[PDB]
Structure formats: structure tokens, C-alpha cells
Amino acid sequence: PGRRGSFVEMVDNLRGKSGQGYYVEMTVGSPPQTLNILVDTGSSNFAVGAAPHPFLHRYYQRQLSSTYRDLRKGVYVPYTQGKWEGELGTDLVSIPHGPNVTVRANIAAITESDKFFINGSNWEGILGLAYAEIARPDDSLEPFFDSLVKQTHVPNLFSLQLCGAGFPLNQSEVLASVGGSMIIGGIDHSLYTGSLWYTPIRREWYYEVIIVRVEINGQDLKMDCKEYNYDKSIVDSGTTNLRLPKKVFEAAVKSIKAASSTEKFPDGFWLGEQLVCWQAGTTPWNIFPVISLYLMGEVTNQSFRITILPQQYLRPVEDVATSQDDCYKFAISQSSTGTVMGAVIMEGFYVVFDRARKRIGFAVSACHVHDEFRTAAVEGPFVTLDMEDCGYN
């Protein structure tokens, strides 16, 4: 049967890019205040700018909302690279290009921040879509999606199609361009090709999954599979890169260098710091390998694989000079906090966060960037033993 798209109201409701994030329009308060909000599957707080900042064009004004409720509690949120503090409260929240519902949700009103708001990102707050376990200050602060499901008939599922352009966009071009879809409460069949394959959510905190095998151009990286999930593996729309645990990063980079060895790249490129450029149109995609991550399947002793191209893991960037060159950064980098399947990975795939069934679905995205010779893939099944042993305790 031909694929029908059943959620037209929500298709094309995202804007942005992998480097700065993908965001959805939301409203907060009465009367509604419109804000652009980062879609973040790697955290669990709804947190919005609530005071002037050089990089905010607008912010939540609690004093103008008749429905604002003060929870009389502060929150201090330090990250590795950035921090903010704010004040907890609740208010009525809607998503204009979303389900036609309004819910009362927790909001962290951000009053001070450092290196959080990004100059030119276009978003004024973040929607943490992960579970209560990792909410701040503690798990009693109900996340947005939990509130939405509890207060409405919206099914306990959302799905994300993040659409990378495959070339740079400036702030203006991001504003004018569609960057993908967040389908709240369903799966839109127009957004993917081939089959959806599902991996279990190992535990409801992050969206944690288990990787059971890694290949570079079909060659097994051949590490003990626990290494791939040390100390966890998560799916995170709020991280740019594919991040890999240090030892896995070292082994993968060695293999990717060997596969691409017909051209020598400087250390700064492999470290994700320095851009590389080619004359317009001549990017040598074919010298770079595909990367396959095998995920635990839902059936005992079965796995499936997702395969990405260099069109996913090479992130388009503007030249530091003035040129018509096509330039990129290497968007795989090291982690000391486990594997992070970030935006550049998610751009390959339609990703179904099936909370109801405690599983994450992957299918090839209808908007993934590719060439005439190769496409991203989602394929299975494979016979794979002892997959639970790949999980780190």
C-alpha cells in the first residue's frame, strides 16, 4: 500500500540545524506568549528565558500571564559547557503546530545563564522530552510530556524527523526554511521509507538503548560490546555530534582514517575543531566509509542495524573565508559519559519515541542527505547472542 501521511497539522513544524538544534514554536501563559523551543530528548526540564539576554529577542514575562503560578523554588543547573539558574512555576502551554490541546505544565523561568543561549540559534528555551528520573531539581518535577499525556487523550508517543540541509544555512535561512517534523501522539508514514525497526528502551531516564556491534564499511570494529555502551548509550536531539566513549572513539577514528586514507586530513579535523573544504561540488563522499550501529531488537537473539553516510557525520559549515567551497566539520567526537546518538545521526532517520511500548523505532528518513550511489539504511534481522551482556552496570 501507498504510505498516507495522517498528521498534516504537525508535519514541517521544526526549524534549525544540527549545530544549533531543532526547535518548535510553543506558547506559554494567558494571553499566549510565543517562544521558539529546542527539542531536547537528552534532558527532562521545560526551561525558558524569562529575563533580557543579549542573545534573546524575546522571553517569558510571568507578570503578563494571568495563569502563572509561582512554585516558590529556585533551580541551579550546571552543565559541562554552560549553566543557568531560574525559578520554578506552572502555566498553560500549547504547541500551535501540535495537538489542539492546552495543558498546565512545569516551567523553569531562566533568570541568569552563562554559555547556554547561543548567538543566532533562534530558540529561547528548551523542551526536555526525557523522563522524570533526570529532571532537576528532582524527579518530583513532572516533565512536559508526562503532563501532556496525563491531562489529554494524546497517545504516549512522539516521533522526530530532523532534516539536515547538507549545506550551510545562516540565521535568516534557518528562519525561512523548514527543518523537519515533531509528530506528537503518532507516526506519520510520509516521513520515512522502508520498515520501522524497534530497539528496547533499556531504562526510562535518558532514552537509553543498547548497541551490540559497530561496523565501518562492513568491517567489524571488534570491541567487547560493553565498550559501546560504557557507561550508557542514549538518543539525544540536544547534542550535535555522534559522541563515542574514548576507547571506541579512538578505534573508530583509526578505522575511518584507514578507509579514507587516499586523502590525508590534519589532526584538527579528526578532533572536530577544524573545517575541511573542497572546491564546489567535489566533496569526495565515496572515499569516506558508511558507519553501521547494530541495536538490540525486540525479539530474543535478534538485532538490526542503522547505517549512516558521511553526508550525516560530516557537518556542513560556512568557510572561515569567502569562497564557493563546500566545507565541513567531522561530527564524531569523544565522550566520557557514554555514546550519544546526536542530531547528525538522527538526521539520517525517522525516530519514533514509543514511550507506551518502551521502545525506539528507526526508519530511513525521507529527508536524509545522500548521493546517487549510497543511501542511509535500516536493515534486519541479524542473529545476535548475549545482547543483554552489552549493557553496562
Ligand SMILES: CCCCNC(=O)[C@@H]1C[C@H]1[C@]12COC[C@H]1CSC(N)=N2
Ligand atoms: C543540538 C543542540 C546543541 C545545543 N544543545 C543544548 O544547548 C542543549 C540544551 C542543553 C542540554 C540540557 O541539559 C544538558 C545540555 C547539554 S546535552 C542536552 N541534550 N541538553
